[PDB]
Amino acid sequence: MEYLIGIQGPDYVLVASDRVAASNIVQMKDDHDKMFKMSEKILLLCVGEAGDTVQFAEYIQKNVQLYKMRNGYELSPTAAANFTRRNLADCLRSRTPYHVNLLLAGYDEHEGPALYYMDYLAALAKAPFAAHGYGAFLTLSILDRYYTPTISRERAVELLRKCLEELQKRFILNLPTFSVRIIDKNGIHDLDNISFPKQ
Amino acid sequence: MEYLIGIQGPDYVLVASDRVAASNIVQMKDDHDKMFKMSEKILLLCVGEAGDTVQFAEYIQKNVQLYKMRNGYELSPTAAANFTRRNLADCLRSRTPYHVNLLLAGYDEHEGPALYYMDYLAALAKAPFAAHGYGAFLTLSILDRYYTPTISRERAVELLRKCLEELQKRFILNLPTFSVRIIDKNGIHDLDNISFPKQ
Amino acid sequence: TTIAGVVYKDGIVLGADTRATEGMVVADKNCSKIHFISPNIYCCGAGTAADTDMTTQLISSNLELHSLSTGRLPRVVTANRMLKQMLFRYQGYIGAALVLGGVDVTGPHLYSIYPHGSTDKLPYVTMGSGSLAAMAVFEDKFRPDMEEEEAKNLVSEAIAAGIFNDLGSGSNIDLCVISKNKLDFLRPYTVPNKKGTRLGRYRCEKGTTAVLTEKITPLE
Amino acid sequence: RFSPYVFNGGTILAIAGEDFAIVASDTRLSEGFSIHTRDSPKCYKLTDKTVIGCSGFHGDCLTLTKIIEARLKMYKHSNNKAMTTGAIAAMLSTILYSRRFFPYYVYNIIGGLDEEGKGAVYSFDPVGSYQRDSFKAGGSASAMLQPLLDNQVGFKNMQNVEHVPLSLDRAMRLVKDVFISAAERDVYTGDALRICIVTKEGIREETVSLRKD
Amino acid sequence: TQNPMVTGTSVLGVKFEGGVVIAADMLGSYGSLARFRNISRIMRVNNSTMLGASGDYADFQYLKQVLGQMVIDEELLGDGHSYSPRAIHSWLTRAMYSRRSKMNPLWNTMVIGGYADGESFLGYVDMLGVAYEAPSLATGYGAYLAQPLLREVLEKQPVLSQTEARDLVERCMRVLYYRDARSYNRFQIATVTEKGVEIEGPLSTETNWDIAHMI
Amino acid sequence: TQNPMVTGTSVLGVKFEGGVVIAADMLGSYGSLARFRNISRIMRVNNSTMLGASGDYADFQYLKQVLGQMVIDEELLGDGHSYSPRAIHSWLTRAMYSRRSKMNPLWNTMVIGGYADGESFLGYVDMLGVAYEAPSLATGYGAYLAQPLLREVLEKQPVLSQTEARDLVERCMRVLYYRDARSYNRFQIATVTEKGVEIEGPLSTETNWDIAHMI
Amino acid sequence: TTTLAFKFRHGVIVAADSRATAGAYIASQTVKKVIEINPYLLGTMAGGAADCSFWERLLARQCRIYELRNKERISVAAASKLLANMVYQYKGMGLSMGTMICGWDKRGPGLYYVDSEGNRISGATFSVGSGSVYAYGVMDRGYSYDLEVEQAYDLARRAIYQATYRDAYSGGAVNLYHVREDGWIRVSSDNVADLHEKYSG
Amino acid sequence: TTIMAVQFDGGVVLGADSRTTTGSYIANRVTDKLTPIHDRIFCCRSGSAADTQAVADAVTYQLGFHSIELNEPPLVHTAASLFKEMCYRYREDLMAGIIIAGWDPQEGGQVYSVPMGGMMVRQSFAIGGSGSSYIYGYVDATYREGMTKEECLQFTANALALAMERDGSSGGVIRLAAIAESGVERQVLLG
Amino acid sequence: TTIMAVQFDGGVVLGADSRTTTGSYIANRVTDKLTPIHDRIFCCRSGSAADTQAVADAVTYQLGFHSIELNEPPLVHTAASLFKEMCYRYREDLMAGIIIAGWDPQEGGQVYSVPMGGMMVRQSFAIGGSGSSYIYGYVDATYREGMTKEECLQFTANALALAMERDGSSGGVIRLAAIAESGVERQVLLG
Amino acid sequence: SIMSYNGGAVMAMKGKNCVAIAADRRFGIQAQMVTTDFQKIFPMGDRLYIGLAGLATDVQTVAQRLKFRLNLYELKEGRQIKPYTLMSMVANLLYEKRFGPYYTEPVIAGLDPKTFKPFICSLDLIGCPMVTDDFVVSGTCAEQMYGMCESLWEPNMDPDHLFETISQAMLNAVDRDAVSGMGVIVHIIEKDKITTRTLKARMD
């Protein structure tokens, strides 16, 4: 229903999102934030059931903040991704099934950048690019077309421009404004809000 | 699903439409035309079932063109609107139910301008403004707010600007470009294509 | 699946095929549907294959625990009482069709156990999908107090009737003879069907397959 | 309630040769878990150069066979000639579509020579689509026979394998081997293997036994 | 017919040297109730062919009415022709298939035994238009019970005499009296030869209950 | 209880001057089958109160077991107290309401007649916890048939003697023998007074069939 | 199943895959999905194979009779109108048909789109199939009206390749036709396994 | 509903109850179950109420028209054939339990049975209805070949009394009919 | 399935068939329907197969433990009370048709009936099972108060033979049991 | 079905003195692939592997629960695990979830930890073991894999022709399947070394 994207580089992770909080037919909030800073080098979006997206991001946030506060250092993005897959798979066979769909985007000091994938059936997948929502059916061709494993981040933003102009050409949705982060050796950096003017 | 509007003036009928031909999740055609010139002073949009919208407009088109070709003069907009209500109400109780939703917009030489309304249950309603689709739930407040029975057509286009800027603010749809006609004592006049730029 | 058993004048003869199907595709050409319980009692299973396997091991574990405590030989009515009480508690959700047979101090005893808990003491039983074919062989050609070689002819005839008439059956025939002292277990007894020879040489030599990336890891 | 359909079984194989056509089928007619008979071939000599196979629901197979046999005679009394191989496949597609909303449950394969003496195999579906192929296998054991002939006849997925045309004698042992392997894993594959060979000189039949389980 | 009210049960049939023997019992049942203890389930078509049936009995009286008329219709021509047992088997197949195609079938299962031109014929007819030929036929639970007894002897010895075949049916009818819940100890045996069609009377079996003392 | 197996039928009751009379029949039915021709459907609680019931009979034996114990429990105290007929009517109401609140009701319909302190009591208890008081009660089809006969006399004359009330029940039990499909010509009449509880024997009615000659 | 069609300065380009499946089982790899109607018209296949094969064959029957009576080839908008009226009579009975109509006309190029749901729209670019959404994105990034002939071949060729690479039901071989003013012409028929080695480097 | 029919040497003996129900309510105390089609041929009807009244009028229409054209007394087997043709043709729409009995000059007394399916069979004694299931054991042991007329009137009286006692559907009053060459005798009993 | 129980002066007489079915297939030709709980108290079981075998083991467990603690022969009414407590408590999960009969020193022969509901009643003769519906009329007219033992063995033999003949569910062979003060006599008949 | 949600195929084959196992590489959701590097073969000690197919949740779940119990077994005892011991261990772990079952079908291949003796088996989703002597298969495209190995397997085969037989068995069966593909990895292990190769398959 809402769209995310996962361009992975050689030493950087380029993630983007949308800012639309949907409703019945109307658009209540148009500057929503799907992002959740877990640590200094690990981000977390979320897509899924409207009550479930908030609390599981809040639940995974604190348990990772326990690890840094007790042991004095940060989780790796690999160990962080495999802690999330445990909690969804355990309480899947339960009276309260869980329904969210989101990866991780992390930078390791030893292993460099990394990108994962997650379904609501809790399956992990190391991937060089990924997407969710219905826009994945219209953008995984372009991002497969114009891809290079040794791409630069200036081309990657320009590649993200190509991925986003096909969104507001053949959709039945609105999706005006898109928020973008970037993760490197120096941590979380906020790029500008990618938007499309109306007039 | 798609949006129409029916601003009625003292001596003019201002109608507008959209140009989007929808699909599953994609937008196949973005310069569609819902309009059907029945005669020199009677127009006809259509909204409904994807197979039914074309043929009933084609069926009502020819039977009105028979009347002008046999008797040598045009139907009134009142007699034209009541011919359409007969054909939907007759074949409603049938093995092939009919599912479309559209009024008429006509100018009489004696009675002046006129605007009707139609449901898929075939009910007529003389109205001073009307709308269909889900956008009627977000525009019948503004058009009730800034209305005057003695409004001028320059204000009416400006009123149509106010009606359309609230569309691309709180929707879950795209709807970029809107086609506009105007009917007067001189017949059908085509105004410019109202659009909203992307960049 | 076709299992059967009979009580002759000195012991009990059991038999089955070795086909285990899956859907409509033969999954196992040589299965094993005769199980160990005690040195005098065996059991044949039918129905859900994992439900018969996990049940027949628990009772055989309990009777080994029971007989080693008593220091004696188990009785067939003990194994009957455990199975009809366990399967009744699970309300028939565990689908296990069983044939229970053994020789006690009291002599030979044969039982049939249905997956709800109903049990029957009979001189001869059939269970399984092709059980109707083997039962027609029994009623046509039964007589009481047969000998051992007459009974081994009868069961191997009845199991073969379910082979050539039922789709779910058809493989090599198992037998077992349990008597007062002798215990015989025959994993092949009669091979009714073979596989035809391969006529065409289909082998292309080494190098006819494209390989992208190889990797070698030595061991010790 | 009264359900009008049931599955019977059978497996049909056709191979388009260079100047021949081989049609093979088993003879088991089963229903549910039981065997009705062990002698029920699926081969039907339509003309001197065309053999059809029919699988699926057996009541529709007997009906659909007798419809085609009438229209062959209706062609000949109206046109003073016999139908070709492709003309029968074009006629059959309209017959299968003619009951679009109450369909036959029948998988059809037509093999035979063309008007130039080459093997032609036309596969079908229960609604009416068709195409010309080099080899098809239809019926219950259709999934166990298609990928093997891709390796042998199609010569796919092999490096440095030459493309020799399939001879007549090499094609005979290819048919006799695949039904042995199909009879091991399928429960519907029966006992007698009726093999019809359509050449430019007539139609030869041949029966090979399988395992009787 | 959507619901069979009064039903029959298994019908047996097997070829022998110069003829076909067919046996069935004489019971009509309404559910678990054995309501009609004395009915006939075998129709003697004219001289060389013969019919027995299972399933709904009210539909069987309908086909008894129709087939009875068609045999009279050719005899009144008097041209020296008759219906072969294969032609009746071909006719009855098209009757079933056209009936089920209108979603209103005839709840039966019919066995046709015939002997013409020195050729024993034995044909099967299903409700769903399934038809074939076999040296031995069985309907209902007899296809599960008596059919393994029929095929075992015939695959050992292909041909049979008349006395061998007649005794073998009485053994199979005995077994069906034990294991079928809706059988009855009163049956009749009908046999075609080159001399014509002959139907025997209400015969019965002899059971064995010596295993009842074994607890 | 989700399915009543063996059921009773209509139970009548009406007050009079110094007592309550209650009558019911002696039949237990399993569907249309009149299986148990001889059962008792009236329990004599200790000295001043009295119970009859309709609905499922196996549930009635359960409440016969429980109420029988509670009366013994107070008599063993011996403090000079007893349960009033209203207190049993109050107790039995809470038993029904708590039972239906667990979605597992007791399929009954109970009538309590009592006479204590010179006061005739007549109480109703439904399966759904509906309870009230009335000068005349009727369950089942008796609420459709005998209840118009009861209210017609009582609204004309409010009080009744014992012989007037006893004869009027026999007229209503006669009418229920005609028009109820699941009634029986064998009933018993139970009556409380100040002298105690007395239950009469298996009485019967006298029908009239003179209209059968009228075609 | 993945088809696409687009018109430009030099006519219309039509491309499609060749795989037809049955549930999770692949029936064949060599299905000719672009149904050749005339020397001047082309039709596609979408969803129901026998439904698209029958009615387009029936559509060719009416176009031939129209030419014999009127001494003129039929127009592209005419043939799309006849097909929409025939399928509408069986509406709600479960027909699967989402084909396209291509051909040259006196008014220039012709491209229409007919569904089994009564849809009949014109346009410039289309993509039909289960893997159609993978073809819209790569084509619209590379589409222009002023393209060359060799340029328009390689755009439509890779666009089918990117669809079959992502989709499971699409695959096989890539057929490619070119509709010109005189009539259509077959361009090529390439295997996906051969294109994979081409676009790897 | 319980119907009864026993033939004897001279003719037949019919019998039925009188109770007509709806749900658990007696719609009618006394009801003529047996129906005079012809002067020598009766039938007793069971199953649906409105169906069996409509079928019995049409057979009386057809047999009455046919017998005058015969100028002959009709056969009992002829009348039972007409119920078979209607009940088999409309077996999807009817619930009829007809038993046809009556004396015939050619063949004496005859009893036929047409159950809900639409078949036809001749019997020595026929019972039907919902309450007929309770007297299968009594009617087998008590029946003896070679009864007089008065034994058959005693035979059917005890048979219907046991069904009325045990069944909740059957009851009311006992109606009898004795058809012979001499005439038709009808009576109403109790006990 | 047809079970039979008749008391007399000295004791009781039991009887049942032997046929055990599943659908329309005979799972077992001969079957002990009657069950020896105690040396003087039997029961004949009906309804489900696995349920009634499980209930009869638990009552034999409880009554056997209680009677040794009594150091007394148990009462027949005591044993019939134990079936009532189990069948009423688990009436949502069981289909049991138990008839309890047996001789008692305090009271002589007794026959109790516990149907599928869970109630209990004492009768002079009790029948049950699926085939018991066909012999309601026969058992009412034939029964006479004040029989000997040999008349009751004749009475139950004809009663089960009529049910076995008419019912498709019942059949097989006839097993009988006669419980008195002297002992228990068991036999197997035909006819 | 639930098994056909992600798809997959696992094949093992016994040779003369060596054993081989292979699987595909595609990870997808019902029409749409995601990646080509989803691991389905997991090492359990040396000269002994295991393959998993079915629902990708239970693939990653059971392979970690089995690894949980395996390291506890090899530390309480000093030795490694025998292949029969592992088959009884997996059949226990699936039968515990008798009514809430895991949707996977394991395949075990390996050698004797004492000799060169190979071992193959496969299990149901509830835990019925099944040992053979030639091959075991699992996954959605099961019937295509039976048609290969019944027509290509020979009893006594060197490690070269064993590699060539299991390669042609996978490349012809998986390309006939729709939801499985995108590369095949092949493990061929023996007494002295472990060889892992990746084949050149159709990427469509």
Side-chain angles (χ1 to χ4, degrees), chain C residues 43-99:
Chain C
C43 182
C44 296
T48 301
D51 286 333
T52 59
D53 288 331
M54 296 302 292
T55 304
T56 195
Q57 292 176 357
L58 182 61
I59 303 298
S60 179
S61 177
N62 291 318
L63 288 175
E64 183 179 2
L65 181 59
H66 179 75
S67 67
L68 190 59
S69 178
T70 63
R72 293 179 183 178
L73 190 68
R75 294 183 182 179
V76 181
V77 297
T78 304
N80 193 7
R81 185 63 61 85
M82 293 180 183
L83 287 170
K84 69 175 75 175
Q85 186 173 358
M86 181 178 175
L87 294 176
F88 181 74
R89 187 180 65 191
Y90 290 100
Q91 297 295 321
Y93 290 105
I94 298 172
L98 295 176
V99 171

Side-chain angles (χ1 to χ4, degrees), chain D residues 7-44 46-160 162-165 167-199 201-202:
Chain D
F7 183 72
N8 296 115
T11 302
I12 306 168
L13 180 60
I15 292 170
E18 180 66 31
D19 55 351
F20 62 94
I22 297 170
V23 176
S25 67
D26 54 350
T27 58
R28 180 176 289 171
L29 182 62
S30 66
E31 180 178 1
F33 287 158
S34 297
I35 302 299
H36 288 285
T37 184
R38 293 179 176 91
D39 193 1
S40 178
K42 277 79 175 175
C43 297
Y44 295 102
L46 296 176
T47 64
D48 292 331
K49 294 186 288 184
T50 298
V51 173
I52 192 168
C54 298
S55 178
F57 175 67
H58 183 74
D60 287 330
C61 293
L62 296 175
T63 299
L64 186 62
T65 303
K66 297 176 73 175
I67 296 169
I68 299 168
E69 293 178 353
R71 294 179 64 88
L72 291 172
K73 294 180 181 179
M74 293 175 70
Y75 185 85
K76 184 174 173 65
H77 292 93
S78 177
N79 293 316
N80 294 318
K81 64 184 288 185
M83 295 181 73
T84 69
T85 302
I88 296 169
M91 182 180 72
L92 183 62
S93 178
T94 61
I95 297 169
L96 294 175
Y97 190 79
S98 65
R99 296 176 69 90
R100 176 62 174 85
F101 300 102
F102 187 75
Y104 296 104
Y105 183 72
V106 165
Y107 293 97
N108 284 313
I109 297 170
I110 294 174
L113 295 176
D114 58 353
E115 292 294 324
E116 294 178 354
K118 294 180 176 66
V121 170
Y122 294 98
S123 66
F124 290 93
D125 57 353
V127 289
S129 178
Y130 69 100
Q131 64 181 357
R132 183 175 180 178
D133 292 331
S134 297
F135 58 95
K136 289 298 292 292
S140 65
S142 179
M144 293 181 183
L145 299 175
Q146 285 295 112
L148 183 58
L149 298 175
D150 293 331
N151 195 3
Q152 298 295 321
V153 179
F155 293 102
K156 292 182 181 180
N157 290 319
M158 292 189 290
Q159 184 60 256
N160 294 319
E162 71 272 14
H163 294 284
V164 60
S167 68
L168 182 61
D169 186 74
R170 184 177 180 271
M172 291 301 292
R173 65 177 63 89
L174 285 174
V175 174
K176 292 181 182 179
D177 287 331
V178 296
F179 284 97
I180 293 173
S181 297
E184 296 293 327
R185 296 292 181 183
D186 192 4
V187 297
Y188 291 103
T189 302
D191 301 338
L193 183 63
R194 181 67 58 84
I195 299 170
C196 293
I197 297 97
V198 175
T199 62
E201 293 84 4

Side-chain angles (χ1 to χ4, degrees), chain H residues 108-186:
Chain H
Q110 288 178 350
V111 172
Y112 293 96
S113 298
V114 179
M116 289 173 66
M119 60 175 283
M120 183 180 72
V121 65
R122 182 176 178 178
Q123 290 178 351
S124 296
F125 62 95
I127 64 174
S130 65
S132 65
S133 298
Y134 295 153
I135 57 171
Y136 285 152
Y138 179 73
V139 79
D140 289 332
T142 312
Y143 181 74
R144 181 182 60 83
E145 183 178 0
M147 292 180 183
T148 64
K149 184 178 75 174
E150 292 85 5
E151 291 178 353
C152 291
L153 270 70
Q154 188 60 255
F155 181 73
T156 63
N158 297 118
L160 293 176
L162 295 173
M164 287 169 64
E165 180 67 28
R166 183 65 66 189
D167 192 6
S169 297
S170 296
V173 78
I174 296 171
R175 288 183 175 271
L176 294 177
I179 298 170
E181 182 179 359
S182 297
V184 174
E185 294 178 353
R186 296 179 67 186

Side-chain angles (χ1 to χ4, degrees), chain J residues 22 34 64 78 97 103 112-113 126 134 144 155 164-165 172 180-181 201:
Chain J
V34 176
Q64 294 176 356
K97 300 294 188 291
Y103 293 97
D112 192 5
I126 53 175
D134 45 356
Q144 293 83 16
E164 295 294 327
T165 297
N172 291 317
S180 296

